[PDB]
Amino acid sequence: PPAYTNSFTRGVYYPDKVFRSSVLHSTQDLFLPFFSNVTWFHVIKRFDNPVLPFNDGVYFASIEKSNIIRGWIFGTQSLLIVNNATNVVIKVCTFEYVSQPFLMDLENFKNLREFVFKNIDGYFKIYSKHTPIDLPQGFSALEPLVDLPIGINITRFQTLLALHRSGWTAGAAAYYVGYLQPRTFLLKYNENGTITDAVDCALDPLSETKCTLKSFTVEKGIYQTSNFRVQPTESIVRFPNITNLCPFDEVFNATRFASVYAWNRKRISNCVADYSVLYNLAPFFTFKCYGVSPTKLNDLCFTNVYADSFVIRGDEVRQIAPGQTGNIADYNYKLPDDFTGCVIAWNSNKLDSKVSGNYNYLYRLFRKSNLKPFERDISPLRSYSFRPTYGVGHQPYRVVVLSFELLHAPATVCGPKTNLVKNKCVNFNFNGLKGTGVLTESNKKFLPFQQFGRDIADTTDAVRDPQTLEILDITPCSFGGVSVITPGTNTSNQVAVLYQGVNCTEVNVFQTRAGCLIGAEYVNNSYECDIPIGAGICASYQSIIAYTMSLGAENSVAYSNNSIAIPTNFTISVTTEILPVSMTKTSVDCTMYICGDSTECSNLLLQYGSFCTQLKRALTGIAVEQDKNTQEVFAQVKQIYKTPPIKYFGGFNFSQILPDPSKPSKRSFIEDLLFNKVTKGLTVLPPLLTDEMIAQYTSALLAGTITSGWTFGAGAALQIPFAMQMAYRFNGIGVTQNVLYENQKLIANQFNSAIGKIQDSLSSTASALGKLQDVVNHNAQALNTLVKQLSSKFGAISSVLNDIFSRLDPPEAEVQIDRLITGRLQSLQTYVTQQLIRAAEIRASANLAATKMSECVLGQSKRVDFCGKGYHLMSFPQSAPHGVVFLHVTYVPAQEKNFTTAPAICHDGKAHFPREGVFVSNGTHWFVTQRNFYEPQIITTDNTFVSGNCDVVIGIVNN
Amino acid sequence: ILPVSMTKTSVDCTMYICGDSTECSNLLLQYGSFCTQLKRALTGIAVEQDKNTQEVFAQVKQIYKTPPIKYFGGFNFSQILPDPSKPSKRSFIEDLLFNKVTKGLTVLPPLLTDEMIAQYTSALLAGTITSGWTFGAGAALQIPFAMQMAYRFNGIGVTQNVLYENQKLIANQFNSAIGKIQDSLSSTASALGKLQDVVNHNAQALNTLVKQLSSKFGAISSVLNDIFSRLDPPEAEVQIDRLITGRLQSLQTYVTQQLIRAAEIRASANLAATKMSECVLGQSKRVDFCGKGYHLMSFPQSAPHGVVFLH
Amino acid sequence: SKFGAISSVLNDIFSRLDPPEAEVQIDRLITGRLQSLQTYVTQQLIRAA
Numbered sequence A: 001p002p003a004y005t006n007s008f009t010r011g012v013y014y015p016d017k018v019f020r021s022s023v024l025h026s027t028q029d030l031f032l033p034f035f036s037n038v039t040w041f042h043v044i045k046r047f048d049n050p051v052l053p054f055n056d057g058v059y060f061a062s063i064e065k066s067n068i069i070r071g072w073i074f075g076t077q078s079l080l081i082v083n084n085a086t087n088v089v090i091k092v093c094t095f096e097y098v099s100q101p102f103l104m105d106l107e108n109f110k111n112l113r114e115f116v117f118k119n120i121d122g123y124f125k126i127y128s129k130h131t132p133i134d135l136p137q138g139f140s141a142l143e144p145l146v147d148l149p150i151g152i153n154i155t156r157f158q159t160l161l162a163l164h165r166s167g168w169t170a171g172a173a174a175y176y177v178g179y180l181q182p183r184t185f186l187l188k189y190n191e192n193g194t195i196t197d198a199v200d201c202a203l204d205p206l207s208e209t210k211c212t213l214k215s216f217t218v219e220k221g222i223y224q225t226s227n228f229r230v231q232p233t234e235s236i237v238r239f240p241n242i243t244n245l246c247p248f249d250e251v252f253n254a255t256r257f258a259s260v261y262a263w264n265r266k267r268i269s270n271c272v273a274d275y276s277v278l279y280n281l282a283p284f285f286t287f288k289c290y291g292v293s294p295t296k297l298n299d300l301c302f303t304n305v306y307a308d309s310f311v312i313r314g315d316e317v318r319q320i321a322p323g324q325t326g327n328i329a330d331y332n333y334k335l336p337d338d339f340t341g342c343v344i345a346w347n348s349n350k351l352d353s354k355v356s357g358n359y360n361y362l363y364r365l366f367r368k369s370n371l372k373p374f375e376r377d378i379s380p381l382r383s384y385s386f387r388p389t390y391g392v393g394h395q396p397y398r399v400v401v402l403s404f405e406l407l408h409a410p411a412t413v414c415g416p417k418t419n420l421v422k423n424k425c426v427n428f429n430f431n432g433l434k435g436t437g438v439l440t441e442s443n444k445k446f447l448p449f450q451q452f453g454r455d456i457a458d459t460t461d462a463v464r465d466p467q468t469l470e471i472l473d474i475t476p477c478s479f480g481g482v483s484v485i486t487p488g489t490n491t492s493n494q495v496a497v498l499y500q501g502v503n504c505t506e507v508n509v510f511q512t513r514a515g516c517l518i519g520a521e522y523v524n525n526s527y528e529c530d531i532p533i534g535a536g537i538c539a540s541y542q543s544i545i546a547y548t549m550s551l552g553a554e555n556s557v558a559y560s561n562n563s564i565a566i567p568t569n570f571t572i573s574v575t576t577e578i579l580p581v582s583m584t585k586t587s588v589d590c591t592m593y594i595c596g597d598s599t600e601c602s603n604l605l606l607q608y609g610s611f612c613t614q615l616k617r618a619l620t621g622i623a624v625e626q627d628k629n630t631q632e633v634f635a636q637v638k639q640i641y642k643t644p645p646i647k648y649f650g651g652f653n654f655s656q657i658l659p660d661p662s663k664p665s666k667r668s669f670i671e672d673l674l675f676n677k678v679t680k681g682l683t684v685l686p687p688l689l690t691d692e693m694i695a696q697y698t699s700a701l702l703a704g705t706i707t708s709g710w711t712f713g714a715g716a717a718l719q720i721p722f723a724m725q726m727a728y729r730f731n732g733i734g735v736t737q738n739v740l741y742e743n744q745k746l747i748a749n750q751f752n753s754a755i756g757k758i759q760d761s762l763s764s765t766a767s768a769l770g771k772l773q774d775v776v777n778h779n780a781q782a783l784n785t786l787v788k789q790l791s792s793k794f795g796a797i798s799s800v801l802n803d804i805f806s807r808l809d810p811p812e813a814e815v816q817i818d819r820l821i822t823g824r825l826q827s828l829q830t831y832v833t834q835q836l837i838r839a840a841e842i843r844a845s846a847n848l849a850a851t852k853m854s855e856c857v858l859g860q861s862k863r864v865d866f867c868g869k870g871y872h873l874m875s876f877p878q879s880a881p882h883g884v885v886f887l888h889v890t891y892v893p894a895q896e897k898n899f900t901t902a903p904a905i906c907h908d909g910k911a912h913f914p915r916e917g918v919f920v921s922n923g924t925h926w927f928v929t930q931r932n933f934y935e936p937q938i939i940t941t942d943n944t945f946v947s948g949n950c951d952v953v954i955g956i957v958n959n
Numbered sequence B: 001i002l003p004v005s006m007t008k009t010s011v012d013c014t015m016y017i018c019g020d021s022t023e024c025s026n027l028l029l030q031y032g033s034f035c036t037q038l039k040r041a042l043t044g045i046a047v048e049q050d051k052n053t054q055e056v057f058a059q060v061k062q063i064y065k066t067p068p069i070k071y072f073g074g075f076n077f078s079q080i081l082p083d084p085s086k087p088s089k090r091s092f093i094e095d096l097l098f099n100k101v102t103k104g105l106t107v108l109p110p111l112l113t114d115e116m117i118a119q120y121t122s123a124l125l126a127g128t129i130t131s132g133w134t135f136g137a138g139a140a141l142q143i144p145f146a147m148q149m150a151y152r153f154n155g156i157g158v159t160q161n162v163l164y165e166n167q168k169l170i171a172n173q174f175n176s177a178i179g180k181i182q183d184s185l186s187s188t189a190s191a192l193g194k195l196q197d198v199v200n201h202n203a204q205a206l207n208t209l210v211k212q213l214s215s216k217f218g219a220i221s222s223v224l225n226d227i228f229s230r231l232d233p234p235e236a237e238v239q240i241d242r243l244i245t246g247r248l249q250s251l252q253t254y255v256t257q258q259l260i261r262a263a264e265i266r267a268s269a270n271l272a273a274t275k276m277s278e279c280v281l282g283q284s285k286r287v288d289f290c291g292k293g294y295h296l297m298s299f300p301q302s303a304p305h306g307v308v309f310l311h
Numbered sequence C: 001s002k003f004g005a006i007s008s009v010l011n012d013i014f015s016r017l018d019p020p021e022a023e024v025q026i027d028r029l030i031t032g033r034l035q036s037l038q039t040y041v042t043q044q045l046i047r048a049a
């Protein structure tokens, strides 16, 4: 029986004969799906190998051992490959090809053969691969062997098997079946330029996330990938279907008609008419319709409608034809040559037969001159000798014709050209008004003359059907982008798809206030947020779940009316702030960028005005302001400081930051890992301050801020003890120097553990350089579009300006030059403007970083939550590509404790207040402690002052 | 008043320019990654908006809460602090703000909805009131309000005895001033100038955006079918290219000024976070930064896409 | 700035080309100078920020 199995990762071929190295190139072509239900075939007693159609195109593989498959038959010219005992021959009998006896080379299974059959645009590509191998572990790139311009289509292929005859037994055989449909793979090339993986953008949500990120390792986070829209389903065509009604009673069921010369002309206008009446009645047999096609009457409508009623005889109907003349034709009525009219004929014997005899018809016979078209004569009369002995074909026949005319007046007569849908995201078309949305009830009452209402946003919001008098509300149908909830591949592999404000009734499964969510099960509990999902939804892995973002550490403060709690401990938590102080300054030659060495390009471009010059001026301003930012950020001091050759800093270890004399490039480990982690027509100008000089300024700034304190920003550096300096910094954050004095070595120990955690976090944190890498990505992608918009082949025969010149006359070749250069110049100008705004943002950030350097490093900042979280102490710089990294010291308190405090001790009528401390008790003794730390001190007459009496202090006590 | 958020949006470039027209989409997709630049710049705007919102409101990961027993010793903050009896947990001042203030594109919801922003503001108030400024630097170290204001007067150069003799009178002055704030916000159309105008700027920015689609540029019909039916296909293609490139330039220009306000209000919101640090999360020595004059105290309040303070 | 116009100023286009095509070429200069104006305004906004 046929068997089904997973195709896994087979079918990866190079698209053409173009080699690419170390690129993640993604291209669109006919490709075979991944993880497909590939049928397994076996031949054993039974023989089930029916005809295998070609369809669009077939990827076929043969797991061949001992060369049992020898050839096939291709035909509907037909393609065949034959291998006799000598060599291998390829035959198409238009197309011929000779290659190698590969299939004869043939150099339990020891080998596996691989084949490719591709047939588009008359080019037939085969890739050959001998793979010496329940699937054995291995892989092979599909080498491009041959391309043959067959120019033929073969709509079927067959399978041939080899038996053994002297009994006879048919061996077990298998083959693989798949087909190519246009999709877009994503590749990877290793150091040796070989494919190791291919992922389409259209198999999996994981696959398309990979396609978007262009990186096969994913850290974590919510990524936007695509959009969701509800596609329309039906075509709605609406017109005056019912409404009024056209006059047909006196046209068809009128009792009496008129004579030809006095033919009745009447106006039919502004009425609803249906064409199905004549079509659905049998007697109206003859419908040969002149000048205008009756099928397209649903599209074309004339100015007005005329219905002429008249009576003619039988034998002279044949005489009415073009190219002939006669008495009746030249003196009664001459038909138009361009007659755009439509005729109806039927039997009317009951309406034409009279027993008493019809002798009341008159007509005008004598005329002085020939009648002209669209003319009437009223300026001699014969009676028609009609007799009942007339033949079957000579009896009078009634014909009624509708006549239409074309004039300058607008078409005032047009009929309906239908059904009304309800409550579906489909098209609504009311007299030419198109749209897309849902149709719901409308609570708003219009006025009878008003049809189309609008909202504030100047959009169609309400509509009423021209035939059915109901007001409807057109709410926009569900709209939302496709964003993927997928954590790092190091943790999971499942995907989750989110829909921004869209109900899944248009697509376990969970419905949120952002719509419906597919791929996670909602959790009613509260957990700390990790990745924001939307509208207060966050995910935490403990599979993929989504829950309303818990606020965080939900807590109720223990407000006290008479008691205080002050921390007795803390931590020096040190973090990283990364501020990009510069960017990749660029200066672009306009003429080079557009055409370079093209004389005509250069001459015809430089006369287009000062565009290139002004853009270059803007870029030069950009470059000089990066140089200025570097000046303001780094070179705020002109006296080059160097630490003494002894790298001793009072027990504080700084081995990972100082410049190292061992390395000739003066490169610290932190900037080492930063360098490792960071990643024609392009111009990069070297920094005015190279990495070496930037590092030297960092060294000098450190020398100042450690050895000589914060004075070096005010001129010459003033030598000052480092721990008295840090005591001053504690004083600046409201902490007494005794805290540092009695915590000297231990605070050193926490400082060392903190810097070690810093270096570990920098080493193991791929997101620490996120902003810098982000700036680099802007630079890169801007350059990519900037360059690629010119030399893109786009799969045409030739994309050469000289090719256009050779294929066109010079007058229009110059026009093509103009169009091309204008397009490229506009693209460049857009790039430059984007660069300008990015530069302004970087300029703001750079002023920010200069302020950080000045107020966090060259001195202490009391401005909380600018130089790091909490009361900020001091900071350290370090170099970074086009940027800088600042390490901050912050006093973060911990280990809070309630304490028994007194407002005033009323002794001898005096209420006692301190300048800075708070009086507290441990239970048996009363001590004074400061604001941001619990530090008891002796309460004497010296260290306290009496201000006010006891009748104003809240909390009178006796002690 | 400081604008904080904007009506963040992401524009499907193809849907914007063309709609569901397969011909227009096929034409447009060959014009390069300008659309990708547009979308990704807008995504940068959105993530910037969310991170400004987080810096402004989720400055503390730990969420302190106001007890129903609001025993402040006679300092009633009912109009700023949402009442537990009030169903949707929003301040009356927020209600005044909200009822005072007033396709093919999207509006993304804030990560912190109106309720969650209000809750963040409530946590900030609880910290800065019951526990004072230290909750920015760590745990909300509880500290009684009269002595917290005594610390503030020691900040501006006043002894705590002066407060204790003046506690009742400054309380009455403060509550009367709060009443004046209530009346001024209720009756003052110019009280919300900055937020109302930034909401405007977003609004008529989007409005000129949508009317740009109504800029005909001299053709017969913006739907491609009429152009093809009444014109030769070769010239129809070129006119299609002209119209779509005009609209593409318009969208690029719109997002250009959108980035311009992105930077502007980003700096403003940085200032807002800085002044919650210096004004809510502590005392500022800065002049003309927590309002006019020496600073004493501040109370943040939620607002549509922005914040409002009573310094 | 020529902007692909055989004459760079409006009155000279009027004098040098018949009105039916002079109007369209004037339109082309109008949109080019418009581009220039938006560029200048964007520089103005950035500088003023």
Ligand SMILES: *[C@@H]1O[C@H](CO)[C@@H](O[C@@H]2O[C@H](CO)[C@@H](O)[C@H](O)[C@H]2NC(C)=O)[C@H](O)[C@H]1NC(C)=O
Residues within 6 Å of the ligand: A568, A569, A570, A571, A749, A750, A753
């Ligand atoms: C304050 O906290 C620090 C750590 O946060 C404490 O330091 C630790 O003290 C214990 C007690 O002997 C030692 O075993 C640890 O080795 C210390 N840590 C380190 C990194 O060395 C300190 O003792 C605390 N002080 C008070 C008064 O509570």
Ligand SMILES: *[C@@H]1O[C@H](CO)[C@@H](O)[C@H](O)[C@H]1NC(C)=O
Residues within 6 Å of the ligand: A647, A648, A649, A651, A652, A653, A654, A655
């Ligand atoms: C400080 O720690 C570093 C870490 O490697 C060590 O090399 C150094 O000897 C220690 N002591 C001093 C005084 O730097």
Ligand SMILES: *[C@@H]1O[C@H](CO)[C@@H](O)[C@H](O)[C@H]1NC(C)=O
Residues within 6 Å of the ligand: A558, A565, A896, A897, A898
């Ligand atoms: C102080 O005591 C109260 C009593 O309920 C308790 O809730 C609070 O956590 C205590 N605070 C400290 C810092 O010990």
Ligand SMILES: *[C@@H]1O[C@H](CO)[C@@H](O)[C@H](O)[C@H]1NC(C)=O
Residues within 6 Å of the ligand: A922, A923, A924, A925
């Ligand atoms: C409180 O501290 C004092 C001195 O620091 C000490 O003498 C006393 O014993 C302490 N109280 C208790 C209950 O131990």
Ligand SMILES: *[C@@H]1O[C@H](CO)[C@@H](O)[C@H](O)[C@H]1NC(C)=O
Residues within 6 Å of the ligand: B074, B075, B076, B077, B078
């Ligand atoms: C404070 O204001 C509220 C609301 O305006 C009012 O109900 C209350 O009586 C006022 N006074 C106190 C002490 O709460």
